[PDB]
Design a protein around this ligand. Sequence first.
Ligand SMILES: NC[C@H](Cl)[C@@H](O)c1cnc(N)[nH]1
Ligand SMILES: [Cl-]
Ligand SMILES: [Cl-]
Ligand SMILES: [Cl-]
Ligand SMILES: [Cl-]
Ligand SMILES: [K+]
Ligand SMILES: [Mg+2]
Ligand SMILES: [Mg+2]
Ligand SMILES: [Mg+2]
Ligand SMILES: [Mg+2]
Ligand SMILES: [Mg+2]
Ligand SMILES: [Mg+2]
Ligand SMILES: [Mg+2]
Ligand SMILES: [Mg+2]
Ligand SMILES: [Mg+2]
Ligand SMILES: [Mg+2]
Ligand SMILES: [Mg+2]
Ligand SMILES: [Mg+2]
Ligand SMILES: [Mg+2]
Ligand SMILES: [Mg+2]
Ligand SMILES: [Mg+2]
Ligand SMILES: [Mg+2]
Ligand SMILES: [Mg+2]
Ligand SMILES: [Mg+2]
Ligand SMILES: [Mg+2]
Ligand SMILES: [Mg+2]
Ligand SMILES: [Mg+2]
Ligand SMILES: [Mg+2]
Ligand SMILES: [Mg+2]
Ligand SMILES: [Mg+2]
Ligand SMILES: [Mg+2]
Ligand SMILES: [Mg+2]
Ligand SMILES: [Mg+2]
Ligand SMILES: [Mg+2]
Ligand SMILES: [Mg+2]
Ligand SMILES: [Mg+2]
Ligand SMILES: [Mg+2]
Ligand SMILES: [Mg+2]
Ligand SMILES: [Mg+2]
Ligand SMILES: [Mg+2]
Ligand SMILES: [Mg+2]
Ligand SMILES: [Mg+2]
Ligand SMILES: [Mg+2]
Ligand SMILES: [Mg+2]
Ligand SMILES: [Mg+2]
Ligand SMILES: [Mg+2]
Ligand SMILES: [Mg+2]
Ligand SMILES: [Mg+2]
Ligand SMILES: [Mg+2]
Ligand SMILES: [Mg+2]
Ligand SMILES: [Mg+2]
Ligand SMILES: [Mg+2]
Ligand SMILES: [Mg+2]
Ligand SMILES: [Mg+2]
Ligand SMILES: [Mg+2]
Ligand SMILES: [Mg+2]
Ligand SMILES: [Mg+2]
Ligand SMILES: [Mg+2]
Ligand SMILES: [Mg+2]
Ligand SMILES: [Mg+2]
Ligand SMILES: [Mg+2]
Ligand SMILES: [Mg+2]
Ligand SMILES: [Mg+2]
Ligand SMILES: [Mg+2]
Ligand SMILES: [Mg+2]
Ligand SMILES: [Mg+2]
Ligand SMILES: [Mg+2]
Ligand SMILES: [Mg+2]
Ligand SMILES: [Mg+2]
Ligand SMILES: [Mg+2]
Ligand SMILES: [Mg+2]
Ligand SMILES: [Mg+2]
Ligand SMILES: [Mg+2]
Ligand SMILES: [Mg+2]
Ligand SMILES: [Mg+2]
Ligand SMILES: [Mg+2]
Ligand SMILES: [Mg+2]
Ligand code: NA
Ligand code: NA
Ligand code: NA
Ligand code: NA
Ligand code: NA
Ligand code: NA
Ligand code: NA
Ligand code: NA
Ligand code: NA
Ligand code: NA
Ligand code: NA
Ligand code: NA
Ligand code: NA
Ligand code: NA
Ligand code: NA
Ligand code: NA
Ligand code: NA
Ligand code: NA
Ligand code: NA
Ligand code: NA
Ligand code: NA
Ligand code: NA
Ligand code: NA
Ligand code: NA
Ligand code: NA
Ligand code: NA
Ligand code: NA
Ligand code: NA
Ligand code: NA
Ligand code: NA
Ligand code: NA
Ligand code: NA
Ligand code: NA
Length: 237
Amino acid sequence: GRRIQGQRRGRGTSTFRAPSHRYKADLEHRKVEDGDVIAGTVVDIEHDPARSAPVAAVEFEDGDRRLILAPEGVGVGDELQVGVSAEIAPGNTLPLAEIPEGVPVCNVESSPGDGGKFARASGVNAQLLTHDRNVAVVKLPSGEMKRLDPQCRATIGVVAGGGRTDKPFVKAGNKHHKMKARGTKWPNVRGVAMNAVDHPFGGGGRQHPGKPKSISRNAPPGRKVGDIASKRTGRGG
RNA sequence: UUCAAGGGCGGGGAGCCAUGUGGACACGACCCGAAUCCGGACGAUCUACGCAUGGACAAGAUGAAGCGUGCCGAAAGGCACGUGGAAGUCUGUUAGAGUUGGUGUCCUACAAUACCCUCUCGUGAUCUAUGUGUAGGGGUGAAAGGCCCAUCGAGUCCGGCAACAGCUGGUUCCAAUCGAAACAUGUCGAAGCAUGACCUCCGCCGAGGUAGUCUGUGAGGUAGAGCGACCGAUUGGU
RNA sequence: UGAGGCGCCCAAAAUGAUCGGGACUCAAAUCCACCACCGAGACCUGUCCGUACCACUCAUACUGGUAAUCGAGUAGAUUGGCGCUCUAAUUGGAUGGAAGUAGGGGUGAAAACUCCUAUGGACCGAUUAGUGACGAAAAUCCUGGCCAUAGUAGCAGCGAUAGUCGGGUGAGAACCCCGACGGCCUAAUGGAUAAGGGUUCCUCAGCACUGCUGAUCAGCUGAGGGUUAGCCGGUCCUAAGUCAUACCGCAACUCGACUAUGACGAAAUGGGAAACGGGUUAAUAUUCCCGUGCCACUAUGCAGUGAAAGUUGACGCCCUGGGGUCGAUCACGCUGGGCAUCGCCCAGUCGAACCGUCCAACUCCGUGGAAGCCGUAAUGGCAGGAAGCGGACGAACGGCGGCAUAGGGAAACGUGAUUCAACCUGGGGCCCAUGAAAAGACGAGCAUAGUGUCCGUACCGAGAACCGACACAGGUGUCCAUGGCGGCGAAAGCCAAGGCCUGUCGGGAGCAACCAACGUUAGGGAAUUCGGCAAGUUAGUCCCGUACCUUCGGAAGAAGGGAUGCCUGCUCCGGAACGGAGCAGGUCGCAGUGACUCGGAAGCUCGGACUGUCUAGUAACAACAUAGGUGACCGCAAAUCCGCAAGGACUCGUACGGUCACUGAAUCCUGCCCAGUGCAGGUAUCUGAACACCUCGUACAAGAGGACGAAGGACCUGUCAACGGCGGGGGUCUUAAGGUAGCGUAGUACCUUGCCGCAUCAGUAGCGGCUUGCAUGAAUGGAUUAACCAGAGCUUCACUGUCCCAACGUUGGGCCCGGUGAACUGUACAUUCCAGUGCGGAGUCUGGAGACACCCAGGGGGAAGCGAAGACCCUAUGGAGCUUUACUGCAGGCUGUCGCUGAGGACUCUCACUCCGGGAGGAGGACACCGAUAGCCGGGCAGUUUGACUGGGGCGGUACGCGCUCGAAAAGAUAUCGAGCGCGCCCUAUGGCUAUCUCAGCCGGGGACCCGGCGAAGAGUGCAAGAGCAAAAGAUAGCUUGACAGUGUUCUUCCCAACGAGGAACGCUGACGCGAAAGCGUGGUCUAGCGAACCAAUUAGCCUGCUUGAUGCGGGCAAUUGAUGACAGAAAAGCUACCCUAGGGAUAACAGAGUCGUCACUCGCAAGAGCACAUAUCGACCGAGUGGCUUGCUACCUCGAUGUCGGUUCCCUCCAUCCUGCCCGUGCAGAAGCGGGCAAGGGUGAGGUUGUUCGCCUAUUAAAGGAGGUCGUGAGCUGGGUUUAGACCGUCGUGAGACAGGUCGGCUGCUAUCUACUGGGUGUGUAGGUGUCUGACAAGAACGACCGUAUAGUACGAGAGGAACUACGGUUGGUGGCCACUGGUGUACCGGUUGUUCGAGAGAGCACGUGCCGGGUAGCCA
Ligand SMILES: NC[C@H](Cl)[C@@H](O)c1cnc(N)[nH]1
Ligand SMILES: [Cl-]
Ligand SMILES: [Cl-]
Ligand SMILES: [Cl-]
Ligand SMILES: [Cl-]
Ligand SMILES: [K+]
Ligand SMILES: [Mg+2]
Ligand SMILES: [Mg+2]
Ligand SMILES: [Mg+2]
Ligand SMILES: [Mg+2]
Ligand SMILES: [Mg+2]
Ligand SMILES: [Mg+2]
Ligand SMILES: [Mg+2]
Ligand SMILES: [Mg+2]
Ligand SMILES: [Mg+2]
Ligand SMILES: [Mg+2]
Ligand SMILES: [Mg+2]
Ligand SMILES: [Mg+2]
Ligand SMILES: [Mg+2]
Ligand SMILES: [Mg+2]
Ligand SMILES: [Mg+2]
Ligand SMILES: [Mg+2]
Ligand SMILES: [Mg+2]
Ligand SMILES: [Mg+2]
Ligand SMILES: [Mg+2]
Ligand SMILES: [Mg+2]
Ligand SMILES: [Mg+2]
Ligand SMILES: [Mg+2]
Ligand SMILES: [Mg+2]
Ligand SMILES: [Mg+2]
Ligand SMILES: [Mg+2]
Ligand SMILES: [Mg+2]
Ligand SMILES: [Mg+2]
Ligand SMILES: [Mg+2]
Ligand SMILES: [Mg+2]
Ligand SMILES: [Mg+2]
Ligand SMILES: [Mg+2]
Ligand SMILES: [Mg+2]
Ligand SMILES: [Mg+2]
Ligand SMILES: [Mg+2]
Ligand SMILES: [Mg+2]
Ligand SMILES: [Mg+2]
Ligand SMILES: [Mg+2]
Ligand SMILES: [Mg+2]
Ligand SMILES: [Mg+2]
Ligand SMILES: [Mg+2]
Ligand SMILES: [Mg+2]
Ligand SMILES: [Mg+2]
Ligand SMILES: [Mg+2]
Ligand SMILES: [Mg+2]
Ligand SMILES: [Mg+2]
Ligand SMILES: [Mg+2]
Ligand SMILES: [Mg+2]
Ligand SMILES: [Mg+2]
Ligand SMILES: [Mg+2]
Ligand SMILES: [Mg+2]
Ligand SMILES: [Mg+2]
Ligand SMILES: [Mg+2]
Ligand SMILES: [Mg+2]
Ligand SMILES: [Mg+2]
Ligand SMILES: [Mg+2]
Ligand SMILES: [Mg+2]
Ligand SMILES: [Mg+2]
Ligand SMILES: [Mg+2]
Ligand SMILES: [Mg+2]
Ligand SMILES: [Mg+2]
Ligand SMILES: [Mg+2]
Ligand SMILES: [Mg+2]
Ligand SMILES: [Mg+2]
Ligand SMILES: [Mg+2]
Ligand SMILES: [Mg+2]
Ligand SMILES: [Mg+2]
Ligand SMILES: [Mg+2]
Ligand SMILES: [Mg+2]
Ligand SMILES: [Mg+2]
Ligand SMILES: [Mg+2]
Ligand SMILES: [Mg+2]
Ligand code: NA
Ligand code: NA
Ligand code: NA
Ligand code: NA
Ligand code: NA
Ligand code: NA
Ligand code: NA
Ligand code: NA
Ligand code: NA
Ligand code: NA
Ligand code: NA
Ligand code: NA
Ligand code: NA
Ligand code: NA
Ligand code: NA
Ligand code: NA
Ligand code: NA
Ligand code: NA
Ligand code: NA
Ligand code: NA
Ligand code: NA
Ligand code: NA
Ligand code: NA
Ligand code: NA
Ligand code: NA
Ligand code: NA
Ligand code: NA
Ligand code: NA
Ligand code: NA
Ligand code: NA
Ligand code: NA
Ligand code: NA
Ligand code: NA
């Protein structure tokens, strides 16, 4: 047979890459010596081509000009602060330790100082639940309880652009334009619509998969397709 | 080998070398003949998909939201007219792109995919130039096994290479003698082999031989016949 | 009355009859005898040759002899010889002419040798012994040359049909030049360029080459010449991205990812310092020249201390206002031209870069002070301050002044305006889409001077300069989109400017047939056809008006109805237009969107929701995509994926993510099943590898066992919007459940043209209903559904040459002439036709018939025409792509163990190692990673296998190893998918010996038992069948283990006749059993019951292992057991319609051929019925046949191809006759029939469903017969069906994929050499002429059929009803001819009229070969 589409992807050819050269900024938390004296003013609100959501242009006291993962409720003129003794309001960034429980937070770090990893897409937010000297339980948007280092910095508020998924693309053209700004090959041809040579589900005189769709985790690339290690399938039960 | 017996192999000196020649096996193996498989290279001037930077789309039609004015109403709002100018929107040989029917013309062509009429799209998932990326069990693919320079169910070039075939074709001077087998046994064997039958040639042996007939001593159950002779069929009558 | 001979009836086939033909009758037939002849290479005979043998001989040299008992031959074995090359030895020829070549003479059976003449002009032989790239008719053989083809095809076809008359030059002119007339091109056939080409550019001189003809011309040939830059490009900058170096990897590199650095990366078309005007050359030109201007740098001088913040470069899509130049147009003036019925029409009326100046818009400031005003095309603005007023900043490639008594013009050398490309400047809207960067510039003055190198620059830029082998009808980017009329228009049509007559061969025929494009056709109007394919109809604009349905958008231009020009005078909107909307009156035509441009409309059903995608080159579709729905994986040191590694994509991303899949808009919905399979989770117990550990073993080791036990598995649970399933039976069973909503004869329904209805004259169609559904059904998605569609089917109106049924015309060919000039094809011969024969499909064989030769044109009957080593089918121990629970392996994932790896069966720590963090430092941490190994999963990938037999192959079967009877032809041998049927064991006795004994069955006496008799065998003997057996081979009893060990002979296996294992018969040696003994026992009475090498285990003795001894553990001689049943032994599954190759007519489909069971038809007998009556009519059983249409069988012909079914068109035939003519019978009154005979002249038609043939149906008819010609007819047509590649549905399958199921789409090559015929000529023969005839023969259907009237309301008949002979009139079909008449044509002609151009008028051109409309002569036609 020939290599399946999932294998072509790995090669990182043009068709599969993201238009990085068009992307604006690698939104990461600032590196403050300590103290927390660092603050800045929201100079503008831009569209982030990589996340289909707003990103705030900020200018810091030390001259530094950098874009940022803007949560909802931030506008031009607003003063944002970053540091251990930063104020407890939307747009400000401080370790989960200095953050009062029950307060929605976004752009949470995994390892303190990594710049933020969790909850960064439109509308989402984590949820600081439990405190400690060692751990700070945070409920990620997927609903998982993530035990974290209290030193992990995070931003107060829900990520801006909420509700994006509510309106349907309606037409292929709209999907086309979105897809064109991501690292994804689109449209999608169904495996069952290909030839035996092209995909494990290909072939036949009619369209249906050969074997059952649920594939073992141990399956090799070229075969791992369909329902990957499904714990169950369907809706009933 | 063997208590034993019986068997196997060997034994009363002919070889070695050379030259010519018959035949066998390995090798290209009398010659040509095809689809492969493998290696290293050369191709994205075609084309597929992506990217960068540019360019293109007469004219008309329909008239979304929003806004306005007016009437009605306590309000909510509603109705009318106007404004507005949305759309993978419509008409359109604008440019440009595509390719449905004619199964027309052509079919040693104008052309190794052409001509004419017809037909579809024509502000978008649009078309297009140039630059640029992806390379061969690998790309690319809105998927047809499509496309990757007239080459694709695995490109092209050279090499491995004089690939192998039990399959088709061909294998060049004269004469004299003998003269088949198209069968048997085994065979992944039945389009092939080996071993026999049969053809030929050579050396050896040394007096018989037997294609015909008659007679003698034997073998035999086919034709025919018959079945109160077995066997099994198969009519009727007192 | 019996028998015999010969004949007769029975007796039907397709191009032209036959005994080979003629033809034959007291035979030239037949039968019985006879006589004589002809007739082979046989037989006889003369001579010769070869071969064999004999005598003589050294001899195979001579000579003599023998052959009645020698003389054919494919494959093949054997042997003597001819010829070629070069070597050697011996020996010769040649300039007094070698070799070769051409023609000719002689020898040899022959290969071949040799001579003569001519040519040639320098080499050439012989004998012997050697040598070898040593002998050709063939291979779709190779290379070269050449003939026919043939003076043939092409040099016509394209919406660009282009020329003509004069003249010039010249040896020569249709096409080279000049003038005129006439045309063509308008986003191109014009102008400027990119790539690419590369000198093609210009000049001179030429024509051997090239140029579709010619050429004096040329992109050709030769020689010269030609490209000038500070201000156009490059150059510089950076883009997607590329490379180089370092680092790292790799066995290694010219390899490889990341991270650094550097460099590269844009000539039309990214960014960017600066040039305009005129002039000039044969050829350059923002480059040269004249004039004027500008930029950068540097130097000097003055100014300036500012100088880096910021601005710029610098940016998406849609709508839109304002500013505004060119252009165009309008008014008017001037200059020049044109026209001449008028007073119109055309051209010009010029003038840059640059310098200076002006400024709308936006932004802002002051003033002011709106509580409702301001403002816009629109949105909008405001007490947070609206209008107004003043002001700051601030635009054009624009205005204005200079530039400029510069330039340019023959001259005048204008002025206003409107609409306004360019250019400038604003406002609004959209994004699940956010629309480069860097260099540079600005910021930041002025004078004067100096410098400004290097590379490109010609020309083409395309129906001749590029790519496509070509001067190729193809392909190929940019700018000119503002030239006039027209009109909505960058549309058509017409015309400027500019270009061209080079989409480059001509001349001639009223110019025939035929073909390509096309115009028009009366009446009818889809009757055509698979199907309205093709064509046609409709059309522009305004007014009125508009259904079902609908997702409320749409449907919709629904449909339907009306209007439409010109002229005169006006109104309204607007600032106005040379803008738009209307009014009144007048008025012409057949026609006013007058041409051109320019929808045909309506309805039902199927499918996919829609726009979109696709098989470059037969599929555009229902297929892919899509939004939408759904499930799965993953918290990022992730899931998924790429790399060998170093590393990488996703990712400048983070669950509202992105990966992996299914379904495929909206709406209503989406049932039941977890047994199998998959995936996932759990798990007491069971199973589960290696290391380590324990035991045995070994002075060690191999090795054997044990304990512990991971993932995995067993087991359990979860899960179907996972793969998939949703029946049989009865009022449960397989295997989990047992089909719910819906839909249903479906693109799924075999039966099937289902039934009913609608519709039609008629409807395998279509729609609706029913529906038991061969074999519908829910995200393998079910149902429904508006809109959409080059998608499939059907209906109606309209339309029409699709048809009835064809005609005429137009243009280009075609035909003739000049010039140019191929190809395909060719074993040979060839004037054939009818029959026959033959490998069964002959121009060539056989018999006849016909046939004088050559040539022109034609349409293609035949050469199983030409073209392609058949795609179909089978075969090959062929190939490839694909699949899987085929075989074997390889990646990869999971898991244990070892190493890295450290301190203190569960736990702490830090110090390696990893990651985060700039770092301090944090997280993690002996784990992870990495290296190694083990177990599991593992078509992700690789190599392969997947047998043979066979009335082809497959399915089935096994005639694949064995035994018996028969087949089998009285020895032996003997085939078939031949007939009957068996064996793959069983038995410790069912073996062995001995003793005693005789059985089946029947009878008689007291189905057990006892007694007698008859009883050669029918019993019994393990199991087929055949055979053997009676004091036994059977029965009973007793005893016994010979079913023993060893080694042979012979036969068999395998006749003859080689071959293994196996088997048997018969010995010997040893040991035994039984018997008095002879003797019997080498298993079972005989013929079936069986298996090699390698390896293991097993039995007993011995041989043996590398200097040597001991021990362990090995190697071996002999034999037993373990299986290969495909049974003389491989370890082994499938699909291909995506296919590929080698071959086969060794083998299937189609056609032919044989057969004829089948089928069609007939006959013999005649039961029976027909009210009686076999035979008017019907007709069984049985029996005998004919045909070659069906079907089947066979495997002869072709696989280096004989093109399919159906249809069509055109021709001939058969008769078994449907009609028509003439007859016979009748259950014949008549009329109408029924049955039969002769008879093939003619006729046998039109339509509805269906691809159909067939068949069903309708209405007409005299009747609407059947069949043959390769199931006649594809070098004739068509292409609906079968049967390629795409796709769907049902069924089947794990799957690829399949189907003798359905469905949508899906290509039709060739220039005719021969032959054949239709027609036309030229010659020869008969043997200079003119005119007229004859008639051997040949062709015809030239005529076939019907209706009507009189006969006649007659004959006949109760009546109803109702004939004929004959005579007439017409119709239909066929045929031949003709055009007065009717009709068509009529691009002859005349008129009307639209647009445009020539100024108007007059008169004309174009609008495709007439713009359109109306009329239409001749001719040709129906
Ligand atoms: N294939 C098995 C062989 Cl032929 C075996 O039977 C045998 C017999 N003789 C042999 N030499 N080999
Ligand atoms: Cl998305
Ligand atoms: Cl000889
Ligand atoms: Cl240039
Ligand atoms: Cl505005
Ligand atoms: K064939
Ligand atoms: Mg990031
Ligand atoms: Mg992309
Ligand atoms: Mg899809
Ligand atoms: Mg497919
Ligand atoms: Mg596969
Ligand atoms: Mg499907
Ligand atoms: Mg499916
Ligand atoms: Mg390219
Ligand atoms: Mg409007
Ligand atoms: Mg559109
Ligand atoms: Mg259109
Ligand atoms: Mg490109
Ligand atoms: Mg396919
Ligand atoms: Mg010979
Ligand atoms: Mg001889
Ligand atoms: Mg007999
Ligand atoms: Mg002979
Ligand atoms: Mg000599
Ligand atoms: Mg030969
Ligand atoms: Mg010819
Ligand atoms: Mg013309
Ligand atoms: Mg030159
Ligand atoms: Mg020239
Ligand atoms: Mg000249
Ligand atoms: Mg550069
Ligand atoms: Mg540029
Ligand atoms: Mg020039
Ligand atoms: Mg030039
Ligand atoms: Mg030309
Ligand atoms: Mg007509
Ligand atoms: Mg019809
Ligand atoms: Mg018909
Ligand atoms: Mg049509
Ligand atoms: Mg007005
Ligand atoms: Mg249907
Ligand atoms: Mg569609
Ligand atoms: Mg195609
Ligand atoms: Mg299409
Ligand atoms: Mg097509
Ligand atoms: Mg689909
Ligand atoms: Mg989806
Ligand atoms: Mg989805
Ligand atoms: Mg029906
Ligand atoms: Mg379901
Ligand atoms: Mg072949
Ligand atoms: Mg096949
Ligand atoms: Mg294969
Ligand atoms: Mg790191
Ligand atoms: Mg495989
Ligand atoms: Mg191999
Ligand atoms: Mg076979
Ligand atoms: Mg015998
Ligand atoms: Mg015996
Ligand atoms: Mg073995
Ligand atoms: Mg054993
Ligand atoms: Mg065998
Ligand atoms: Mg055998
Ligand atoms: Mg083949
Ligand atoms: Mg045959
Ligand atoms: Mg033929
Ligand atoms: Mg007759
Ligand atoms: Mg006749
Ligand atoms: Mg036929
Ligand atoms: Mg016929
Ligand atoms: Mg034919
Ligand atoms: Mg044909
Ligand atoms: Mg032809
Ligand atoms: Mg067809
Ligand atoms: Mg069809
Ligand atoms: Mg079809
Ligand atoms: Mg004309
Ligand atoms: Na499939
Ligand atoms: Na191979
Ligand atoms: Na390319
Ligand atoms: Na509105
Ligand atoms: Na076309
Ligand atoms: Na390859
Ligand atoms: Na090779
Ligand atoms: Na081979
Ligand atoms: Na044979
Ligand atoms: Na054989
Ligand atoms: Na063979
Ligand atoms: Na004798
Ligand atoms: Na007999
Ligand atoms: Na011979
Ligand atoms: Na105009
Ligand atoms: Na010419
Ligand atoms: Na569209
Ligand atoms: Na289950
Ligand atoms: Na299950
Ligand atoms: Na089902
Ligand atoms: Na479409
Ligand atoms: Na016509
Ligand atoms: Na012909
Ligand atoms: Na293949
Ligand atoms: Na096999
Ligand atoms: Na034997
Ligand atoms: Na017959
Ligand atoms: Na042939
Ligand atoms: Na036909
Ligand atoms: Na007749
Ligand atoms: Na035929
Ligand atoms: Na046909
Ligand atoms: Na054809």
